[PDB]
Enzyme design. Structure first.
Site, PDB file in Angstrom:
ATOM      1  N   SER A 180       0.790  -1.226   0.000  1.00 44.92           N
ATOM      2  CA  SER A 180       0.000   0.000   0.000  1.00 44.92           C
ATOM      3  C   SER A 180       0.830   1.289   0.000  1.00 44.92           C
ATOM      4  O   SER A 180       1.667   1.503   0.883  1.00 44.92           O
ATOM      5  CB  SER A 180      -0.953  -0.035   1.206  1.00 44.92           C
ATOM      6  OG  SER A 180      -1.729   1.146   1.312  1.00 44.92           O
ATOM      7  N   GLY A 181       0.594   2.138  -0.999  1.00 43.74           N
ATOM      8  CA  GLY A 181       1.300   3.405  -1.099  1.00 43.74           C
ATOM      9  C   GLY A 181       2.575   3.391  -1.914  1.00 43.74           C
ATOM     10  O   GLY A 181       3.181   4.431  -2.136  1.00 43.74           O
ATOM     11  N   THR A 185      -0.853   2.619  -8.512  1.00 44.36           N
ATOM     12  CA  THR A 185      -1.849   3.435  -9.185  1.00 44.36           C
ATOM     13  C   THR A 185      -1.265   4.531 -10.072  1.00 44.36           C
ATOM     14  O   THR A 185      -1.780   4.779 -11.161  1.00 44.36           O
ATOM     15  CB  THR A 185      -2.796   4.055  -8.154  1.00 44.36           C
ATOM     16  OG1 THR A 185      -3.544   3.009  -7.525  1.00 44.36           O
ATOM     17  CG2 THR A 185      -3.749   5.048  -8.809  1.00 44.36           C
ATOM     18  N   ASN A 232      -1.773   5.569   2.890  1.00 48.54           N
ATOM     19  CA  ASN A 232      -1.820   6.248   1.613  1.00 48.54           C
ATOM     20  C   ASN A 232      -2.993   7.223   1.591  1.00 48.54           C
ATOM     21  O   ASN A 232      -4.119   6.859   1.917  1.00 48.54           O
ATOM     22  CB  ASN A 232      -1.952   5.197   0.506  1.00 48.54           C
ATOM     23  CG  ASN A 232      -1.955   5.798  -0.883  1.00 48.54           C
ATOM     24  OD1 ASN A 232      -2.041   7.015  -1.056  1.00 48.54           O
ATOM     25  ND2 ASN A 232      -1.875   4.941  -1.885  1.00 48.54           N
ATOM     26  N   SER A 235      -5.465   5.898  -1.270  1.00 51.96           N
ATOM     27  CA  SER A 235      -5.513   4.442  -1.341  1.00 51.96           C
ATOM     28  C   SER A 235      -6.699   3.940  -2.156  1.00 51.96           C
ATOM     29  O   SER A 235      -7.829   4.406  -1.980  1.00 51.96           O
ATOM     30  CB  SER A 235      -5.577   3.847   0.072  1.00 51.96           C
ATOM     31  OG  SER A 235      -5.584   2.435   0.046  1.00 51.96           O
ATOM     32  N   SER A 236      -6.424   2.995  -3.057  1.00 51.08           N
ATOM     33  CA  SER A 236      -7.456   2.384  -3.894  1.00 51.08           C
ATOM     34  C   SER A 236      -8.144   1.318  -3.047  1.00 51.08           C
ATOM     35  O   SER A 236      -7.511   0.347  -2.629  1.00 51.08           O
ATOM     36  CB  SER A 236      -6.821   1.727  -5.113  1.00 51.08           C
ATOM     37  OG  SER A 236      -5.958   2.623  -5.778  1.00 51.08           O
ATOM     38  N   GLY A 456      -2.914  -2.834  -2.717  1.00 47.09           N
ATOM     39  CA  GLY A 456      -1.707  -3.426  -2.186  1.00 47.09           C
ATOM     40  C   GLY A 456      -1.772  -4.001  -0.796  1.00 47.09           C
ATOM     41  O   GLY A 456      -2.639  -3.651  -0.006  1.00 47.09           O
ATOM     42  N   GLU A 458      -1.563  -4.703   2.888  1.00 50.12           N
ATOM     43  CA  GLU A 458      -1.650  -3.742   3.973  1.00 50.12           C
ATOM     44  C   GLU A 458      -1.803  -4.368   5.341  1.00 50.12           C
ATOM     45  O   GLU A 458      -2.287  -5.487   5.479  1.00 50.12           O
ATOM     46  CB  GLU A 458      -2.812  -2.772   3.731  1.00 50.12           C
ATOM     47  CG  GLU A 458      -4.199  -3.398   3.761  1.00 50.12           C
ATOM     48  CD  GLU A 458      -5.291  -2.385   3.437  1.00 50.12           C
ATOM     49  OE1 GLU A 458      -6.470  -2.664   3.735  1.00 50.12           O
ATOM     50  OE2 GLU A 458      -4.975  -1.313   2.875  1.00 50.12           O
TER      51      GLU A 458
HETATM   52  N1  LIG Z   1       5.917   8.091  -9.833  1.00 46.32           N
HETATM   53  C1  LIG Z   1       5.432   8.923  -8.937  1.00 46.32           C
HETATM   54  N2  LIG Z   1       5.569  10.238  -9.055  1.00 46.32           N
HETATM   55  C2  LIG Z   1       5.120  11.101  -8.170  1.00 46.32           C
HETATM   56  N3  LIG Z   1       4.485  10.763  -7.094  1.00 46.32           N
HETATM   57  C3  LIG Z   1       4.235   9.472  -6.845  1.00 46.32           C
HETATM   58  C4  LIG Z   1       4.713   8.440  -7.771  1.00 46.32           C
HETATM   59  N4  LIG Z   1       4.369   7.278  -7.285  1.00 46.32           N
HETATM   60  C5  LIG Z   1       3.738   7.515  -6.183  1.00 46.32           C
HETATM   61  N5  LIG Z   1       3.638   8.796  -5.912  1.00 46.32           N
HETATM   62  C6  LIG Z   1       3.019   9.308  -4.723  1.00 46.32           C
HETATM   63  O1  LIG Z   1       2.737   8.232  -3.868  1.00 46.32           O
HETATM   64  C7  LIG Z   1       1.341   8.158  -3.621  1.00 46.32           C
HETATM   65  C8  LIG Z   1       0.836   6.733  -3.496  1.00 46.32           C
HETATM   66  O2  LIG Z   1       0.909   5.994  -4.704  1.00 46.32           O
HETATM   67  P1  LIG Z   1      -0.223   5.111  -5.196  1.00 46.32           P
HETATM   68  O3  LIG Z   1       0.165   4.890  -6.531  1.00 46.32           O
HETATM   69  O4  LIG Z   1      -1.425   5.819  -5.024  1.00 46.32           O
HETATM   70  O5  LIG Z   1      -0.218   3.790  -4.252  1.00 46.32           O
HETATM   71  P2  LIG Z   1      -0.999   2.577  -4.600  1.00 46.32           P
HETATM   72  O6  LIG Z   1      -1.593   2.460  -5.635  1.00 46.32           O
HETATM   73  O7  LIG Z   1       0.423   1.631  -4.723  1.00 46.32           O
HETATM   74  O8  LIG Z   1      -1.648   1.877  -3.339  1.00 46.32           O
HETATM   75  C9  LIG Z   1       0.728   8.962  -4.751  1.00 46.32           C
HETATM   76  O9  LIG Z   1      -0.542   9.425  -4.458  1.00 46.32           O
HETATM   77  C10 LIG Z   1       1.739  10.027  -4.998  1.00 46.32           C
HETATM   78  O10 LIG Z   1       1.754  11.027  -4.023  1.00 46.32           O
HETATM   79  O1  VO4 Z   2      -2.912   1.925  -0.836  1.00 42.59           O
HETATM   80  V1  VO4 Z   2      -3.011   1.144  -2.414  1.00 42.59           V
HETATM   81  O2  VO4 Z   2      -2.136  -0.383  -2.588  1.00 42.59           O
HETATM   82  O3  VO4 Z   2      -3.981   1.746  -3.796  1.00 42.59           O
HETATM   83  O4  VO4 Z   2      -4.410   0.258  -1.811  1.00 42.59           O
HETATM   84 MG   LIG Z   3      -3.816   2.547  -5.657  1.00 45.85          MG
END
Ligand SMILES: Nc1ncnc2c1ncn2[C@@H]1O[C@H](COP(=O)(O)OP(=O)(O)O)[C@@H](O)[C@H]1O
Ligand code: VO4
Ligand SMILES: [Mg+2]
Length: 692
Positions: A180-181, A185, A232, A235-236, A456, A458
């Site tokens: 997670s985070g 996404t 996050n 978070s999705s 992800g 968690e």
């Molecule tokens: N490549 C990137 N560039 C800029 N910021 C990023 C990047 N990847 C992640 N982040 C930051 O990290 C946060 C969490 O990523 P996210 O993709 O939402 O997590 P996830 O999908 O893995 O649970 C984003 O909202 C953003 O602030």
């Molecule tokens: O915090 V994420 O892996 O989108 O659920």
């Molecule tokens: Mg996500």
């Protein structure tokens, strides 16, 4: 050519900076170094020591301080020649050990180089800040380049999957893993953007509308499906597999989205320092005065579903500004002005429903003294407030074939109000997806590239059925990587008889997988289902049965001595303790029929489809009982995995730098646990000593 012009943004942001004279003097040195642990307790924190001497099987090196240690050569983590620091592909490292791989990742990270190849797959370390590398100019650079000709990038792995789809005429998949985070996404968004560009159509007037709708489909789902958790801020809370479809010529023909199990419980409960879905906050902040008025809206602090966590704001985010985006995404996709207002009446309705305060009457049954919230919800939904009232506290059921009116107490009435809310939100989410999908699916595809963006792995202080389903999914995605990276690879070698000695890479999540979805012997989900359909079953009879079956019998299961309501499951990413409370009802996902009846007669058209449409309002019946949440999810996760097997997969491993969502803080322990459990170094060893 930007690729070679050292003065370009590409070179500036995607390439390693030129070292200097002093760095050259260090690069041509004859001294040899080793990575060691100053503290043998903390094996993830390393320092660099110089090797001063050597015997046939040992190394004697000096520690940062005043001392000297000796180590067996076969137990030494030698440091790669510094010329390797920043290498774009780690399969190129002389010494492949943990501190070595981390060091290279750290070197690149410290220069905002978040992408690094690790053999056949790409690793991505979350920057936690913006980096100018996803511009249209950057997209054009990667257009058509071979992976080794350009720098590591999510655009690069995307183009490769693209060419493979065209060259081999086979379907592709981009599997982006990570806890997670970690950044799954964001990278998912990038893969969509890139494909949309290099494969979209740029004709005028009517042209390119599809690719624009494809892109606008994400912000809508994010507003209804993402929320702030302690790991996050975005978070999705639902899984997602996106299918980018191409015609025979190689042009985007369309796309469809397959969502997976939204957190429906979040709508009615958020733990401290978390938020409900973004949408609730974007409406309350972006709605006009009339909308706000015809909806009976107020501030977040005025709603029970929005004022319990203590957090209504997210640092650096404007829900009001976010709302404008969401609505613009809906326009572009095609949501009529009518549909949208219905969509917000539902959101508003859900908010009012959470305000209904049930109380005890003269007896055990519950009563509703104040009907303000109730009346408000009834208004926005377009349902009879009195029908709704009796359906909540006095729902009718069959006792044999007899029709008996129940009189739910305070607790029961509240839970029933919550079930409605969740069914309401849950169906809305499915409707939104269905809708968007009809827009994007306008042509029979010839090929597709599937982009998976799951929730992800968690862990929280309190882990419930929701977390188990999420971590079970991550556990299966990981086994998918192990399967393809090692099992199938070697199963191939040995088949051709190319003189290969089998290697056991020590990566196998099957035991944990069987414990969860095992059927014979029955796993956790199977037992959950049994109890779920057993009348006299309680959450206490469920945990007792779980312990009974696995306690001291399964290596991946643990019956804690500190609690009677939790059980642990050893996942690839770590042990997780789960709280059994409410698992029976969560798996049953019950909803009083009187409630459905009350809404099947709603004046609102959207609301009516959510309750009269089979696909949305109907539930499969596993014989005499409705299919359980666990059985359906296990079933849907199995389709996906079967779909992935029918494609050529490309892996992207997102790595989270720390647990504080802070930029410029790469923490070794946090990072090394991930590299380990993800099987990154073993992934590099198979590419190095094998035959790709
Ligand atoms: N490549 C990137 N560039 C800029 N910021 C990023 C990047 N990847 C992640 N982040 C930051 O990290 C946060 C969490 O990523 P996210 O993709 O939402 O997590 P996830 O999908 O893995 O649970 C984003 O909202 C953003 O602030
Ligand atoms: O915090 V994420 O892996 O989108 O659920
Ligand atoms: Mg996500």
């Amino acid at each position: 050519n930007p690729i070679h012009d050292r003065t370009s943004d590409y070179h500036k942001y995607l390439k390693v900076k030129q070292g200097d004279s002093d760095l050259f003097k260090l690069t041509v040195s004859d001294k040899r170094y080793i990575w060691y642990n100053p503290d043998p307790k903390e094996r993830d924190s390393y320092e660099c020591g110089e090797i001063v001497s050597e015997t046939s099987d040992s190394f004697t090196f000096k520690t940062v301080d005043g001392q000297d240690r000796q180590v067996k050569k076969d137990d030494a983590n030698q440091r790669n020649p510094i010329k390797f620091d920043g290498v774009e592909d780690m399969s190129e490292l002389s010494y492949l050990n943990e501190p070595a791989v981390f060091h290279n990742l750290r070197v690149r990270y410290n220069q905002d180089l978040i992408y690094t190849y690790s053999g056949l797959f790409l690793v991505a370390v979350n920057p936690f800040k913006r980096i100018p590398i996803y511009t249209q100019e950057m997209v054009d650079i990667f257009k058509g380049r071979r992976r080794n000709e350009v720098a590591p990038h999510i655009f690069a792995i995307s183009d490769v999957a693209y060419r493979s789809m065209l060259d081999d005429r086979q379907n592709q998949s981009l599997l982006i893993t990570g806890e997670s985070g970690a950044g799954k996404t964001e990278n998912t968004k990038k893969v969509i953007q890139y494909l949309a560009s290099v494969a979209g159509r740029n004709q005028a007037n009517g042209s390119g509308v599809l690719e624009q709708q494809i892109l606008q489909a994400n912000p809508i789902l994010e507003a209804f499906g993402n929320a702030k958790t302690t790991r996050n801020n975005n978070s999705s809370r639902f899984g997602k597999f996106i299918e980018i479809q191409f015609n025979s010529a190689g042009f985007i023909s369309g796309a469809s989205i397959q969502s997976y199990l939204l957190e429906k419980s979040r709508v009615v409960f958020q733990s401290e320092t978390e938020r409900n879905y973004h949408i609730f906050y974007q409406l309350l902040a972006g709605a006009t005065a009339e909308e706000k008025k015809a909806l009976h809206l107020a501030g977040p602090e005025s709603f029970n579903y929005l004022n319990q966590s203590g957090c209504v704001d997210i640092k650096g985010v404007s829900d009001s500004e976010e709302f404008k985006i969401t609505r613009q995404a809906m326009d572009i996709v095609g949501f009529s002005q009518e549909e949208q207002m219905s969509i917000f009446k539902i959101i508003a309705g859900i908010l009012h429903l959470g305000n209904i305060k049930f109380e005890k009457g003269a007896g055990e049954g519950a009563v509703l003294k104040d009907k303000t919230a109730l009346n408000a919800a009834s208004t926005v939904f377009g349902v009879n407030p009195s029908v709704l009232e009796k359906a909540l506290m006095e729902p009718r059921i069959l006792a044999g074939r007899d029709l008996v009116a129940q009189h739910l107490n305070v607790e029961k009435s509240s839970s029933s109000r919550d079930a409605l809310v969740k069914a309401l939100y849950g169906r809305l989410f499915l409707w939104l997806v269905k809708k968007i999908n009809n827009v994007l699916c306008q042509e029979r595809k010839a090929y597709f590239i599937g982009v998976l963006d799951i929730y992800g792995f968690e862990i929280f202080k309190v882990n419930s059925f929701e977390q188990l389903c999420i971590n079970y999914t991550n556990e299966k995605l990981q086994q998918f990587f192990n399967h393809h990276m090692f099992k199938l690879e070697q199963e191939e070698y040995l088949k051709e008889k190319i003189n290969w000695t089998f290697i056991d890479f020590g990566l196998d999540s099957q035991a944990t997988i069987d414990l969860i979805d095992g059927r014979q012997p029955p796993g956790i989900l199977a037992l959950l289902d049994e109890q779920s359909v057993f009348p006299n079953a309680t959450d206490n009879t469920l945990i007792t049965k779980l312990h009974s079956h696995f306690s001291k019998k399964n290596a991946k299961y643990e019956e804690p001595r500190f609690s009677k309501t939790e059980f642990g499951v050893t996942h690839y990413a770590g042990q997780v303790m789960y709280e059994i409370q409410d698992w029976l009802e969560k798996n049953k996902d019950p909803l009083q029929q009187d409630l459905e009846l009350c809404f099947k007669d709603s004046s609102d058209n959207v609301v009516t489809k959510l309750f009269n449409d089979p696909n949305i309002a109907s539930r499969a019946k596993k014989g005499a009982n409705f299919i359980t949440v666990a059985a359906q999810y296990k079933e849907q996760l199995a389709s996906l995995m079967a779909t992935l097997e029918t494609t050529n997969p490309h892996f992207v491993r997102c790595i989270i730098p720390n647990n504080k969502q802070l930029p410029a803080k790469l923490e070794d322990k946090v990072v090394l646990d991930q590299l380990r459990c993800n099987g990154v170094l073993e992934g590099i060893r198979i590419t190095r000593k094998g035959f790709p």
